[PDB]
């Protein structure tokens, strides 16, 4: 199907307690394959997927060298924004950045994105056309003029439309066994008495990939979406995800309720009853 490669960068200031912390992670789809932590011993980019382990030193030295640059850049960046926002050099602040590309079923470019956020809030973002920026406030406007100046977005488009897709396809072929799979949800239900007259039906989707899934409860066909408890899709820790939705049902009506599960690794949306 479609695939994606994305890099996430976080950067938090540590007023007086040393350099700013810097954490870079990189995913293909919902699978992490590299990391760099400024507080980790190695001070190198490290792998996290099996398929990237054998990439050669040249590739590692490259990625480390360029992640270190990102690190140092965000170091300056923290300083810039404390200025723009007229803030004290006493408090801690966060710079977050995410960029990557999506590819379609044909493995041809689909879209690209590149966004910043100061203190957990939108700052500036590349637009669909990969040439125009969206400044969220006045300081972001300044950066926008600065970047339109250096033709920033022309160079980005060239990474996102080429290098990025070029490399995503490489990864996808190297980690074929892993990235190109889809695990269908292994589902089941549990029943617990909330009281003498009430039971809780809980619908489980275990061990699936990718994370995207849909769990709905229904009663005689009518979506119970408002009386349904539904937790965030969560990582199992093994490269698969879990999720459940619960409804509180009147004893004696277990039969009127269905759980419907839809995933990419499923040919036909499962339907589960307590029956």
């Amino acid at each position: 199907g479609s695939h994606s490669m994305r890099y996430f960068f976080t950067s938090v200031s540590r007023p007086g307690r040393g350099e700013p912390r810097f954490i870079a992670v990189g995913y293909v789809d919902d699978t992490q394959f590299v990391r760099f932590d400024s507080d980790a011993a190695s001070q190198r980019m490290e792998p996290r997927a099996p398929w990237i382990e054998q990439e050669g030193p040249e590739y590692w030295d490259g990625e480390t060298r360029k992640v270190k640059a990102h690190s140092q850049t965000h170091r300056v960046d923290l300083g810039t924004l404390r200025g723009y926002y007229n803030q004290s050099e006493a408090g801690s602040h966060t710079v977050q950045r995410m960029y990557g590309c999506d590819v379609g079923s044909d493995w041809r470019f689909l879209r690209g994105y590149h966004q910043y956020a100061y203190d957990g809030k939108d700052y500036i973002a590349l637009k669909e056309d990969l040439r125009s920026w969206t400044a969220a406030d006045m300081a972001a406007q300044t950066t926008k003029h600065k970047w339109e100046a250096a033709h920033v977005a022309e160079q980005l488009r060239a990474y996102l439309e080429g290098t990025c897709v070029e490399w995503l396809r490489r990864y996808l072929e190297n980690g074929k066994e892993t990235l190109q799979r889809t695990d269908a949800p292994k589902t089941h239900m549990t029943h617990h008495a909330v009281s003498d007259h009430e039971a809780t039906l809980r619908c489980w989707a275990l061990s699936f990939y990718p994370a995207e899934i849909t769990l709905t409860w229904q009663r005689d066909g009518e979506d119970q979406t408002q009386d349904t408890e539904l937790v965030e899709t969560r990582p199992a820790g093994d490269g698969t995800f879990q999720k459940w939705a619960a409804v509180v049902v009147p004893s004696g009506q277990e039969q009127r309720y269905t759980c419907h599960v839809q995933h990419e690794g499923l040919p036909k949306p499962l339907t589960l009853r307590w029956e």
Binding site: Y7, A24, G26, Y59, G62, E63, K66, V67, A69, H70, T73, V76, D77, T80, L81, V95, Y99, Y116, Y123, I124, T143, K146, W147, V152, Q155, L156, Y159, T163, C164, E166, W167
Partner: peptide, 9 residues
């Protein structure tokens, strides 16, 4: 593969 461009705000 990461991006090579230094990019300052």
């Amino acid at each position: 593969a990461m991006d090579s461009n230094t990019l300052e705000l």
